[PDB]
């Protein structure tokens, strides 16, 4: 009936002065815009059908044409930025916000879906959706005693749309919009559905990626223990944003970083640092590097949890990106560590894997490793054990690598390598 219609037939049906003919043509447009292979989105836009679909959103007297036009517009809004702009330019934002209060849950869900796609385009459309007042009617749809009474797909769509309102930077979402959404977000973080948990974690990861004031807003809500619990989940779609959120929080103050340690996050790192997914290993090592950039008592907790052999591990064998992050963790550790903590790092066998990475064709990693060498030598200077460390670097072929770096293209590498040879190897 409404299967494989031409754009011309859809236009002829929608332009008729018959609500039923318009409904059949709108359903046909929705089915066309729903096909897997190349939906004719640009053809539907060029035919001028977006203003017709937006006007059909207001037809309270005909709920099926509201549903079909909402679905057709959602398919267009899910496309490119230009295709989302076309939906917005047609005045769809206030029309979709009015449908959030619809007594038909399938129409209300379609409006949630459409607003998520519009907000998801970027900062300007996100903030425009907020200015048209979408947050209050969206939050009211979740104002129930128990989230488990809501339809699974409906809750998943609401969570996803809320995460897009938390998403993007330059600028970050308005502070008052973040404050309004956060209590509902804390609630969705304690829900049992894995998809709701994944998208709630992604929302929290977006809110914790920025200045320490943004991290504080989130950390103040007491979500850190729940994020650590989700960090230990079996589902990779939950662990990925949960680790991203924990990683973002430890970029903050020593006090914010401490909340992560107090919640027992370090006990999950033996498995995260050996995770078969390289991106988990990479982001877990990035997280470790920011914790080793903390207080000496925070470095001590890394030591106590037996995580230094795990850092020797990732430095010895991992994808290059994870090895570069391990280098950072070592340099941060040697920068803020006590002599005893730096001595411990050497006893765990950090020197040989640290030297082997001086062969990398990466200027930044080489500078990072050279700074760590200097730091370790400074600790050996305080104990008169510089000779023991010099022999250690000589034996694993580290001296050959530093001597060769005395002819490196980069100025900082050239100077740092010449300094070490002259101070401890001459």
């Amino acid at each position: 009936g409404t299967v494989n219609w031409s754009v011309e037939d859809i236009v002829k049906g929608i332009n008729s002065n018959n609500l039923e003919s318009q409904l059949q043509a709108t359903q046909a447009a929705r089915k066309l815009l729903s096909r897997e292979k190349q939906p004719p989105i640009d053809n539907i836009i060029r035919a001028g059908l977006i203003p017709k679909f937006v006007s059909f959103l207001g037809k309270t007297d005909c709920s099926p044409i509201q549903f079909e036009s909402a679905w057709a517009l959602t398919n267009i809004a899910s496309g490119t930025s230009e295709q989302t702009k076309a939906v917005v330019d047609g005045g769809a934002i206030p029309a979709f916000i009015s449908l959030l209060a619809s007594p038909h849950a399938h129409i209300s869900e379609q409006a949630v879906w459409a607003l998520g796609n519009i907000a998801g385009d970027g900062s300007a459309f996100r903030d425009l959706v907020i200015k048209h007042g979408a947050i209050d009617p969206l939050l009211a749809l979740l104002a129930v005693p128990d989230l488990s009474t809501l339809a699974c797909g409906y809750l998943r769509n609401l969570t996803w749309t809320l995460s897009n309102l938390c998403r993007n930077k330059n600028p970050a979402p308005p502070l008052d919009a973040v404050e309004q959404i956060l209590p509902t977000l804390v609630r969705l973080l304690h829900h049992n559905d894995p998809e709701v948990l994944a998208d709630s974690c992604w929302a929290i990861s977006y809110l914790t990626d920025g200045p320490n004031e943004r991290i504080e807003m989130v950390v103040k809500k007491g979500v850190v223990p729940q994020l650590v619990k989700l960090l230990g989940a079996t589902e990779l779609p939950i662990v990925t944003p949960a680790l991203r959120a924990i990683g973002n929080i430890v970029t903050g103050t020593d006090e914010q970083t401490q909340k992560v340690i107090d919640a027992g996050a370090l006990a999950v790192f033996p498995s995260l640092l050996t995770n078969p997914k390289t991106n988990i290993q990479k982001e877990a090592t990035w997280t470790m590097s920011n914790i080793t950039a903390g207080r000496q008592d925070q470095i001590q907790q890394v030591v106590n949890h037996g995580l230094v052999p795990f850092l020797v591990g990732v430095l010895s064998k991992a994808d290059f990106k994870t090895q570069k992050e391990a280098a950072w963790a070592i340099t941060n550790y040697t920068s803020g560590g006590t002599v005893e903590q730096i001595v411990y790092l050497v006893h765990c066998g950090i020197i040989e894997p640290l030297m082997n990475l001086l062969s990398a064709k990466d200027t930044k990693i080489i500078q990072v490793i050279l700074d760590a060498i200097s730091n370790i030598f400074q600790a050996a200077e305080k104990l008169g054990e510089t000779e023991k460390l010099s022999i250690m670097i000589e034996e694993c072929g580290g001296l050959d690598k530093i001597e060769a770096l005395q002819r490196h293209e980069n100025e900082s590498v050239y100077k740092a390598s010449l300094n070490l040879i002259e101070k401890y190897f001459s």
């Binding site: 990626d209 430890v250 903050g252 920011n290 340099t331």
Partner: peptide, 11 residues
Amino acid sequence: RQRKRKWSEAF
């Protein structure tokens, strides 16, 4: 090398 690195500083 001493300081915290945010997601965009590292990646």
